[PDB]
């Protein structure tokens, strides 16, 4: 009855149910996908993903202002999607760049991020003609300058700032000293020292400022404090160097962390509403300090890739576990685990799980969804409810696994990566194939 | 001065230091290994690993009583070492089995573990002639019974028990109801129901009972209570079925969790000492209930694989981070991260890290060792000390990364698995090659 419901904020946009009670994505029964492709299976609702690109692009004025964070999930097919939808792509190490270039992603729409970019990654970035590099340390700045001079080019950079704001859901914390790896402290003068260094060179050009402040952010307040702090530095810079050397500092990038619904009760605002608030903040903040309004750029991963994909599993074992003298928890063992979704164990993530191969009339029963790994903490959904007649051979799906589940996949217990399939308009296609024993053995020498 | 020291309880047994101040493993400078093989690099002290096998085998009476838990780290090379050293091998899913069989590991010395074994894994295990299956549910028992009967064989099994004991380091917790996925409860009567079920059939033979109680266990008291509880069931079983159908229940397997030193302060007892205590426990408990003393089996992963391997990295970036108005923490960015060692992030692991390419005279300074991934929490060693002159190009090593680090490796940010090398008597050989971009792209369709 209520265990049947697929909260529209949580599930992919193109989710329906059958007349026989099977959940379909983009018109295809989940049962047919498991039949054709096996389980576990990442199922991507392509129209959903593309929708999020378009709405976010519209919300921020242009696809140019929306940089997809590849770390959420990347492969050549997805790089193609982002390319066609007109967004930019943020890449983090050499491997993400090479996969983008392999996919012929236009390098001028690429930004390179990272706290510890090697010489060889910086080298490859400029050789490829990557549009922007977000610099994270004085050392990087030295390195990049030498590399750009060698190549005979002027590299566009942003400097990553630490502004003491950490935002999650409907709260944020402001600290005097952010104690983490990324960026340079505005407060300490470290950020201004970086700005000076970039100005002192010939082969680099400072075109913006970057901050990233959290994840699953549902309110604008963290961003507003962050924006105030970032533009305060802007004020400091053009104050010291004059609106002339600074004219080209045209971009404030407020990073990622746009929030999605994992659970029905999750309540991120519509992106159009949040984006307009952000736009008003940036204009207000810049006028408040006598500056022209900079371009606002945003770097979502989760908010593009997360909601449109589910993980489909087969129930293998159902065990009733005594938890008190009178209560029980129903442990439902499934086809994968921390190998394909480590987020529950790693971050304490909370997911929605539903029976998707039939409609049960059995009453709900408190449950834990667990994997097949030889570790007690191999838990996929810690606290949930299942039909009292859940049985091996039933299919269940976990929602919003499109971001950072596959990106984090391992071969723990020699469990190969699941296949990943894209559905569009009643048609399914394999995108990433499932790993085999040969894959498992492939790094072994002889 | 003291930042130079490599605690012998922490570092591989065949660690020394150069006269030029480079740490060698099995006689090879770590700087040479980084030069030949690149970083990050897993370095396996082969002799150390074998020694651990040999001393644990001796401590428990025989290699037959020591079952290496492959989940800690498995490849064909390692399966070979285990086989040669005369130990048994615990495998957890179909992939671990397949790797074992691929490496020619004797099936009779294999034991299959897991909470969610599929019909296909069970079927492959009996087809291979796997010596033991540790059954975890009533469902598994029914599946295996049918499988064994179809094969025309009698399958030896043990029943995994939950006895409400969870031990770590020098303590344990006893609970009325362990609320987790594995085993059947002695207290609720679920264990006895399973024993009856095995006894009901012709195609299975009950040879023993299994319990696994935690990790990093430094004392014997948790084991004692567990053994008391396990042997209590043994008494109920032979009571109800008579010393007859019960004569072949010859083994009490107390699982894994034997502890190693991650940090110089860590104090696991010598294995011979703990093994003797354990032996005494088993004999005492069985005699207290009028039973002959059962064989004692142990399933270590960490204590075999952990200490003999280190992870070698190159320092790329060094940033001093203000943490209060007066204090600072030195962020030392390295060559890998949560992709090759997720344990700090995942379980709050603590590691020992040391500068290995030179001797520093610089004073020590509070530090954090961090990877190159594009998230704040990509921390390898949260709280450590490094020399004040630590610089890009220096090599550092993290100790005791031989268990559960490679096992759990991912391609987060398209960062390929590092190379794994084995060193023995002044010779190094590549065991597992490092991933390339082609590996990263290999599951892509088109």
From Swiss-Prot, chains A, B:
Keyword annotations: Amino-acid biosynthesis, Decarboxylase, Disulfide bond, Lyase, Lysine biosynthesis, Pyridoxal phosphate
Gene Ontology terms describing biological process: lysine biosynthetic process via diaminopimelate
Single GO MF descriptor: pyridoxal phosphate binding
Cofactor(s), by name: pyridoxal 5'-phosphate
Disruption phenotype: Strains lacking this gene are lysine auxotrophs. They cannot survive in immunocompromised mice.
Annotated positions binding substrate: 215, 302, 343, 347, 375, 404
Pathway connected to this protein: Amino-acid biosynthesis; L-lysine biosynthesis via DAP pathway; L-lysine from DL-2,6-diaminopimelate: step 1/1
Residue numbers annotated as active site: 374
EC number: 4.1.1.20
The keyword Zinc is annotated on this UniProt entry: no
Gene3D superfamilies membership: Alanine racemase, Lyase, Ornithine Decarboxylase, Chain A, domain 1
Keyword Methyltransferase: no
PANTHER family: DIAMINOPIMELATE DECARBOXYLASE, GROUP IV DECARBOXYLASE
Stated role: Specifically catalyzes the decarboxylation of meso-diaminopimelate (meso-DAP) to L-lysine. Is essential for the viability of M.tuberculosis in the host.
Subunit annotation: Homodimer; disulfide-linked. Can also form homotetramer at higher protein concentrations.
Further comment found in the protein's record: Was identified as a high-confidence drug target.
Protein family according to the UniProt entry: Belongs to the Orn/Lys/Arg decarboxylase class-II family. LysA subfamily.
Protein name: Diaminopimelate decarboxylase
